[model samples]
Target: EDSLMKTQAELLLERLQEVRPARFLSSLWERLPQNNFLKVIAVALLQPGSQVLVHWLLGNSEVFAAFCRALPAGLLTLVTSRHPALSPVYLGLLTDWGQRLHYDLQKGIWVGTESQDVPWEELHNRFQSLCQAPPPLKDKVLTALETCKAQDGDFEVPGLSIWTDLLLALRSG
Candidate 1:
């Protein structure tokens, strides 16, 4: 049954491959069943437009919450183990969203960009939980902190400290 589910998921994802990334929005993905959600993610990891999946996930609060509820800490290690594909995209979204969800911004233009109100703190907490027990994602999260630290002095990026502080909290052991 699970293998058949995976087959159907791959077929659907292959079809989705033809749709423009802009068409890959929350409305299309929010109704996804919890059982099949991870399959979509895993399949997308093998496809060319996984970024579309990332954007859709971040753009919908409900689906993102489902995603969080589905994985918890232990299952998250499964995706992190994917390593080459889904791992980086997942981490990149977490890092980028960590900043976007914050309130501080010195950008002179008051006009804001288009975005959804996804649950970032949940992602933040899940990310922190990555350092425990198996700690599979811990090394990568620390490396993320190092990369951001090097860029902090180069420009005034809003909410940049959110990740630094979050990662620092992880380091405060």
Candidate 2:
């Protein structure tokens, strides 16, 4: 049964690698216990090329919902440091992680508290750097960014404020 489990995990890993070349997943393969394979798959969704997989997983069945729900809050933190762009998707999943886990959503919850020191300056500089792109491209990027909202009227979530602050700073600057 143990050997069968490993083989099944290997197969699943091999299939998922096509979605994203998850170095972390590859490294943890043999060492991770059989039951933790879903965590590996979830972590892989945070990798660069897994955008396709991320959306697919999000829209899939309750298997993924259960997986994300069970993931440690620390996993969310890890995803932020390793896959910053992917943090938004994980944010959408936190509803499953529950209210207690949602409490961790401070300014640098994902990136680290040190980043809070020069957040406005850093965010402004980052936006300015993007301003160097072609005007249409720059506008498109800025437009999409502007559309980002953490709070819309009565609807709200914990980390929404962090993203709202960054977007507001960029637009105001």
Q: Judged by TM-score, which candidate is best?
A: 1
Return the TM-score for each candidate structure: 0.48, 0.32
- Model 1 / residue 169 / CA error / Å: 2.2
lDDT of 1 by residue, 1-173 (tens): 65675676566566666765545444445466665766566545444345556555556655654554566555555545544344565566566655555443464211214455345456556666666524456677667756775666523354455555555556656
The sequence of per-residue lDDT tens digits that candidate 2 reaches over residues 1-173 is 54554565455555765643444444444466634766656545454335544544555545454554455444544543454444445444432222122113344442323421322343344444444444544564455454544233322343544445445555544
Over 4 Å off in model 1, which ranges?
A: 1-70, 82-84, 104-115, 118-120, 133-136, 154-160
TM-score of 1: 0.48
Please report, in order, the local distance difference test score of every candidate based on alpha carbons: 0.55, 0.45
In candidate 1, where is summed lDDT lowest over 10 consecutive residues?
108-117
TM-score, model 2 to reference: 0.32
State the weakest 10-residue window (summed lDDT) of model 2: 94-103
